[PDB]
Every structure is written in structure tokens, then in C-alpha cells.
Design an enzyme around this catalytic site. Structure first.
Site, mmCIF file in Angstrom:
data_model
loop_
_atom_site.group_PDB
_atom_site.id
_atom_site.type_symbol
_atom_site.label_atom_id
_atom_site.label_comp_id
_atom_site.label_asym_id
_atom_site.label_seq_id
_atom_site.Cartn_x
_atom_site.Cartn_y
_atom_site.Cartn_z
ATOM 1 C CG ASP A 159 -1.800 1.228 1.322
ATOM 2 O OD1 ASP A 159 -2.555 1.491 0.366
ATOM 3 O OD2 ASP A 159 -1.716 1.958 2.332
ATOM 4 C CB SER A 160 0.282 4.757 -0.887
ATOM 5 O OG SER A 160 -0.942 5.004 -0.218
ATOM 6 C CE1 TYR A 186 2.997 5.702 -3.255
ATOM 7 C CE2 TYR A 186 1.977 3.795 -4.272
ATOM 8 C CZ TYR A 186 3.050 4.365 -3.621
ATOM 9 O OH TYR A 186 4.137 3.540 -3.347
ATOM 10 N N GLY A 187 -2.609 9.208 -4.480
ATOM 11 C CA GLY A 187 -3.849 9.703 -5.089
ATOM 12 C C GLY A 187 -3.659 10.726 -6.200
ATOM 13 C CB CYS A 203 -2.721 0.999 -2.759
ATOM 14 S SG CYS A 203 -2.861 2.728 -3.239
ATOM 15 C CG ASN A 204 -9.031 1.087 -3.600
ATOM 16 O OD1 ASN A 204 -8.680 0.991 -2.423
ATOM 17 N ND2 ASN A 204 -10.146 0.498 -4.069
ATOM 18 C CB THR A 205 -4.202 5.241 -5.818
ATOM 19 O OG1 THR A 205 -5.241 5.968 -5.128
ATOM 20 C CG2 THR A 205 -3.500 6.183 -6.872
ATOM 21 C CD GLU A 260 -2.578 9.608 5.381
ATOM 22 O OE1 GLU A 260 -2.585 8.538 4.730
ATOM 23 O OE2 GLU A 260 -1.630 9.940 6.160
ATOM 24 C CB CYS A 268 -10.145 5.207 -1.124
ATOM 25 S SG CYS A 268 -8.727 6.097 -0.436
ATOM 26 C CB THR A 269 -6.640 2.036 1.769
ATOM 27 O OG1 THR A 269 -6.023 3.311 1.526
ATOM 28 C CG2 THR A 269 -6.055 1.003 0.866
ATOM 29 C CG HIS A 270 -6.977 6.651 3.618
ATOM 30 N ND1 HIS A 270 -6.145 5.738 3.009
ATOM 31 C CD2 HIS A 270 -6.174 7.544 4.242
ATOM 32 C CE1 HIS A 270 -4.887 6.100 3.211
ATOM 33 N NE2 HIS A 270 -4.880 7.172 3.985
HETATM 34 C C1 LIG Z 1 -5.762 2.392 9.387
HETATM 35 C C2 LIG Z 1 -6.723 3.206 10.274
HETATM 36 C C3 LIG Z 1 -6.003 3.519 11.612
HETATM 37 C C4 LIG Z 1 -6.911 4.332 12.528
HETATM 38 O O1 LIG Z 1 -6.310 4.456 13.863
HETATM 39 C C5 LIG Z 1 -5.375 5.412 13.906
HETATM 40 N N1 LIG Z 1 -4.609 5.421 15.007
HETATM 41 C C6 LIG Z 1 -3.654 6.350 15.164
HETATM 42 N N2 LIG Z 1 -2.831 6.355 16.289
HETATM 43 C C7 LIG Z 1 -2.909 5.289 17.316
HETATM 44 C C8 LIG Z 1 -3.784 5.807 18.494
HETATM 45 N N3 LIG Z 1 -2.963 6.436 19.536
HETATM 46 C C9 LIG Z 1 -2.449 7.727 19.056
HETATM 47 C C10 LIG Z 1 -1.764 8.504 20.204
HETATM 48 O O2 LIG Z 1 -2.655 8.756 21.299
HETATM 49 C C11 LIG Z 1 -3.252 7.520 21.777
HETATM 50 C C12 LIG Z 1 -3.915 6.700 20.654
HETATM 51 C C13 LIG Z 1 -3.496 7.351 14.195
HETATM 52 N N4 LIG Z 1 -2.661 8.434 14.019
HETATM 53 C C14 LIG Z 1 -2.984 9.044 12.882
HETATM 54 N N5 LIG Z 1 -3.988 8.318 12.297
HETATM 55 C C15 LIG Z 1 -4.716 8.647 11.106
HETATM 56 C C16 LIG Z 1 -4.393 7.847 9.867
HETATM 57 C C17 LIG Z 1 -5.350 6.983 9.348
HETATM 58 F F1 LIG Z 1 -6.540 6.805 9.963
HETATM 59 C C18 LIG Z 1 -5.060 6.269 8.177
HETATM 60 C C19 LIG Z 1 -3.856 6.444 7.524
HETATM 61 C C20 LIG Z 1 -2.904 7.316 8.036
HETATM 62 C C21 LIG Z 1 -3.189 8.020 9.220
HETATM 63 F F2 LIG Z 1 -2.282 8.857 9.743
HETATM 64 C C22 LIG Z 1 -4.338 7.288 13.095
HETATM 65 N N6 LIG Z 1 -5.270 6.337 12.957
HETATM 66 N N1 LIG Z 2 -4.008 3.867 -0.530
HETATM 67 C C1 LIG Z 2 -4.679 4.934 -1.374
HETATM 68 C C2 LIG Z 2 -5.092 6.193 -0.606
HETATM 69 C C3 LIG Z 2 -3.903 6.985 -0.070
HETATM 70 C C4 LIG Z 2 -3.109 7.531 -1.227
HETATM 71 O O1 LIG Z 2 -3.632 8.475 -1.882
HETATM 72 O O2 LIG Z 2 -1.998 7.003 -1.443
HETATM 73 C C5 LIG Z 2 -5.900 4.338 -2.029
HETATM 74 O O3 LIG Z 2 -6.370 3.261 -1.651
HETATM 75 O O4 LIG Z 2 -6.410 4.981 -2.999
#
Ligand SMILES: CCCCOc1nc(NCCN2CCOCC2)c2ncn(Cc3c(F)cccc3F)c2n1
Ligand SMILES: N[C@H](CCC(=O)O)C(=O)O
Ligand SMILES: CCCCOc1nc(NCCN2CCOCC2)c2ncn(Cc3c(F)cccc3F)c2n1
Ligand SMILES: N[C@H](CCC(=O)O)C(=O)O
Lengths: 269, 266
Positions: free
Chosen positions: B9-10, B41-42, B72-74, B151, B183-185
């Protein structure tokens, strides 16, 4: 054709079933795979397979598979849950073409959709006694709780055209109470006929239970396999039965929305 | 086959797909690589995404994986066909399974897909669906703000809910019965998207459907792991900070003390 034989990908997908019930699977193929040519055979003269000994079901299923193989099908779908339960492994192993049955795709969809890891399946006596579902589910996710329940009265409810009746509702409720202590969130409709009973089963099970349609999921798997191996048909269907062509047509033409649908009676024994 | 399934994935977002694999395929050992240093990557050109995806695939290939999932879908949108054609192992992406699921679930033949600019520009979804079931009307919509919302970690905020509503307003009007989360997100935004579209629109999770397909393929290719726990741990690689990756992954996956390694690509 002038080419000789058809292009490999232009050949039909064959579907075999104990009778007309398997047209629930075919109808899903018409919807999800409209570009594919289909050949269907239902063994109406020996339906039901539900209560029969495994050995008989394997024999009859082989006879159907042999008939369709001679028609140059590129893939065989065992549309019948009862036939899949006892015959799929052997047939799949023996043939050079893709062979898919209707149990594994439903099992996998159930593993995907469950949230609480409590899954049930309903089907014929033969399907349930084979333990095929328990095996298909637990091979991948051995900690999931699986409850398997034979519902022998359900096929006759559909056959008698009573699948929307008060009688249907009473029979389904009476049978499904055997599931009620298992905390299920997912129930596999492990029989060709059960999509016709879906609204009744859903009402009994309630809104928190997701039902899985064997044909819908199996046709999705067929679509995946055709694409993966690049053997999809490029952008008439045939119907065979061991019983009356007319009686088959009356159920099929309307169920499927093919006005000039003609079936052919054949002999297998 | 006791070797691992590889996922690329990206970034960390593709752990939505990996989490589905932990659930549906608990017998399988997994190796995950996220290219956090070059996420997103989007908005990138096709050619660049293909190159990056190849770098990831080549890195996991060296680790003896038995199957590759492009999470990754992209990346899938532009790189799947050429990677699949070249590699000596099965390769699956996250687009076709979503397309197939949408064809399966639709009743009114009106399906939408949302995703990054890259994913939508490729037209991979429209092409996939129309080549299988051409009666279906497909509406494709790039949602560039969505990946940034997720993100940011503030994907449940009032600000996020407003943006999702604004972005999907025209789509709401199309009378869809099915919407692919391309999309993964986007699983992170699922409840907000469902609120906006209404309870009658079925949302399709790319990762959930893809892993269901992987499950079927492991049996079909006869390469499933034996029905027991693997004897070696899952492995996690990132081109970004391992500390940050660990913090996110351990929390999200429920694996305390998950460890990752930082690697270099290109
Ligand atoms: C895959 C989904 C994960 C969701 O869960 C999750 N957990 C985190 N941290 C762990 C939790 N901790 C943080 C510190 O305080 C206590 C708790 C994240 N930080 C940024 N993003 C946001 C994020 C995102 F949701 C996806 C991609 C990238 C990204 F930064 C996060 N998303
Ligand atoms: N992983 C990408 C989203 C994040 C990116 O833009 O790279 C997707 O599934 O499209
Ligand atoms: C598509 C599911 C079919 C379910 O299976 C099935 N089998 C029948 N007959 C079984 C014996 N016949 C078969 C034909 O050859 C001669 C002997 C039915 N009769 C009415 N309905 C009810 C019914 C109907 F009348 C029309 C459509 C659907 C349906 F369930 C029937 N449904
Ligand atoms: N087609 C069978 C139902 C009818 C029968 O018992 O043969 C099934 O799917 O189990």
C-alpha cells in the site's frame, strides 16, 4: 462454426441441479454475468436429492456432469447444495475444466459478513449431514461457531407454491426456533429453493441477521474466476431436464423472463 | 503452502485491508509494506505510481510470498495488470472485487464509486463493471479531501462530516442503491458516508471484498496455509517512521507490541 470449435472463452458455462430449483442460481448468472452463455440441466425425474443416500447423489450428479461435458462447457457449476455437499470434491478432481459448487462461496461470504463469529446454515438433510458447511467455514476460520440445521419441510413449501403463505410462516418459525439459542448474526440459505422463502426467513430471524444467498455468492465467485483467467465471454441459452419440457418451461420462462424459452427432455439413467 | 501473503500500500491506510485478512484468514501469515515516505499516491501521475508499486512488489517478492495483494486502490488502478502478468505468483488488487460485489448487490442498476483522483481518472471501475454487466449505470466521483481527512486523524469531527456531505451532495441525488468505497482510507469514514447517502445505499468495502476473494483463491490455487496458527510472526515494513507505524498499527490491529522495520525503496 467456420473457426472449427468455438473460442474457449465463448463456450457456455454449465449448471447442474436436481430440478428447477437451481434456476435461482441461473437467474443470478443472468444478472451478474449477462454476457455468458449458459447450459442448464435439472434432474427433475429424480428430484429431490435432499433425503437420498450420498452414493446415489454422487451417481446422479456424475450423470449430469457427463451430459454437459459433452457440450464443451468451459466451466461447470454444481448449482445444487445437496449435490455439492457430496459430489463436488470428486468431480472437481476428475475434470480438466473449472468446477465450482454453491457451498464454499456462501461459507466465505458468511465469514466476511459476520461480526460476532456466530454463523448458521440451513439446508436439506443431505447437505447438513455431510458437514460440508462446517468444514468450509472452519478450514479458514476455525474459531467461528457454526450451527447447521436441516429444514426438510422448506423445499416442499416452495414446490407447492405456498412460500408466501401463513402456512409457510408457521413452518419456518417452527423449524428455526432450533437456532434461537445460538446468538447468530448470519444465516446461510444453503439450498437452491430458499431464496423464494427469503422474506419469511428474514422475518423469523429478525433484522439483525444477515442472510446469505448461495447462488448470488457462487455466481460472484464464477465472475471472479472468469476474470482472473481471462476466459469471460466477449461482450441462445439451453435448458435440459429429465422430466417434462413443458412443466419445466412453465416455471422457468416466467421466473427468468425469457419469453420463448424452450426446454429439452433428455434421459440420463 | 506456509509462506506469507504479501500486501502492498502507499502507507498505513492499507491496514484496513490487512485487518480484514486477520479476521477472514486467521490461519495465514502476512507481510505488509506501506510506502509512507511517498504517500499519497492519489494525486500522482500513473507512470510514477506504477514505478513505486513495482518497487514494493519487488521488495516483497524477495521475501518468498506466495501471493501478492495490492491493497491500494490507486496503485491497483494503474499497476495491477502489468504486475500480475509478470509475477510467478498470483496477484490480486482491490478494485475488481469491489466492482464484482457492487454488480452482485445492486437491484436498481445504479452504482457509484468514490476514490482518489488517480483511481477515478483510470476509469478502472467503470471499465470493470461495464465489461461484465453493461446495464448498470456507473457514477464515478473523485473525493480528494477524503484521504486528507482520514490522514489528519480527525475523521469523526464536525468539519469532516460537513466536507463529506458537501462532496457527496451531487452523488446523493443520483438515486444510487450501491456505492463502492474505492480507497483504503474510506472505511474510516463509513458511518459518515452512510449517514449522508442514507441507510438504503449499500456501501462496499474494498478490503472486505478483496479478502473474501483471496480466501476463495487460496483454496482454488491449493495454496492455503494449514488450519493452525503460523509459526512466524506477521511482518510490517514502512519507508517512513517505524515508531509511528507501530503506534498506529498496534492500536488499529489490536496487536500490542507490534514491531515494524524501516526500509528503503528506489
Ligand atoms: C488504518 C486506520 C487507523 C486508525 O487508527 C489510527 N490510530 C492512530 N494512532 C494510534 C492511536 N494512539 C495515538 C496517540 O494517542 C493515543 C492513541 C493514528 N494516528 C494518525 N492516524 C490517522 C491515519 C489513518 F486513519 C489512516 C492512515 C494514516 C493516518 F495517519 C491514526 N489512525
Ligand atoms: N491507498 C490509497 C489512498 C492513499 C493515497 O492516496 O496514497 C488508495 O487506496 O487509494
Ligand atoms: C425457481 C425456483 C423453483 C422452485 O422449485 C419449484 N419446483 C416446482 N415443481 C417441482 C416439480 N416439477 C418441476 C418441473 O418439472 C416437473 C415437476 C414448483 N411448482 C411450483 N413452484 C413455485 C414457483 C413457481 F411456480 C414459479 C417460480 C418460482 C417458484 F418457486 C415450484 N418451485
Ligand atoms: N437443489 C436442492 C434442493 C432440492 C433437492 O432436495 O434436490 C438443494 O439445493 O439442496
Amino acid at each position: 462454426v467456420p473457426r472449427g470449435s468455438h473460442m474457449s472463452n465463448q463456450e457456455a458455462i454449465g449448471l447442474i441441479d436436481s430440478g428447477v430449483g437451481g434456476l435461482t442460481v441461473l437467474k443470478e448468472a443472468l444478472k451478474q454475468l449477462p454476457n455468458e452463455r449458459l447450459i442448464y440441466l435439472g434432474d427433475t425425474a429424480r428430484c429431490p436429492y435432499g433425503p437420498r443416500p450420498a452414493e446415489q447423489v454422487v451417481q446422479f450428479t456424475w450423470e449430469m456432469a457427463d451430459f454437459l461435458l459433452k457440450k464443451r462447457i468451459k466451466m461447470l457449476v454444481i448449482a445444487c447444495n445437496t449435490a455439492t455437499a457430496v459430489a463436488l470434491e470428486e468431480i472437481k478432481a476428475a475434470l480438466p475444466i473449472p468446477v465450482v459448487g454453491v457451498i464454499l462461496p456462501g461459507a466465505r461470504a458468511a465469514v466476511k459478513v459476520t461480526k460476532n463469529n456466530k454463523i448458521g446454515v440451513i439446508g436439506t438433510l443431505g447437505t447438513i449431514k455431510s458437514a460440508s458447511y462446517e468444514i468450509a467455514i472452519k478450514s479458514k476460520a476455525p474459531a467461528i461457531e457454526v450451527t447447521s440445521l436441516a429444514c426438510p419441510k422448506f423445499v416442499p413449501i416452495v414446490e407447492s407454491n405456498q412460500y408466501r403463505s401463513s402456512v409457510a410462516k408457521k413452518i419456518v418459525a417452527e423449524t428455526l426456533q432450533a437456532l434461537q439459542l445460538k446468538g447468530l448474526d448470519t444465516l446461510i440459505l444453503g439450498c437452491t429453493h430458499y431464496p423464494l422463502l427469503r422474506p419469511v426467513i428474514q422475518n423469523v430471524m429478525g433484522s439483525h441477521v444477515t442472510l446469505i444467498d448461495s447462488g448470488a455468492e457462487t455466481v460472484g465467485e464464477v465472475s471472479m474466476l472468469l476474470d482472473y483467467f481471462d476466459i469471460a465471454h466477449t461482450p441462445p441459452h439451453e435448458f435440459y431436464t429429465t422430466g417434462s419440457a413443458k412443466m419445466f418451461e412453465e416455471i422457468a420462462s416466467s421466473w427468468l423472463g425469457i419469453e420463448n424459452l424452450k426446454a429439452q427432455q433428455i434421459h440420463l439413467g
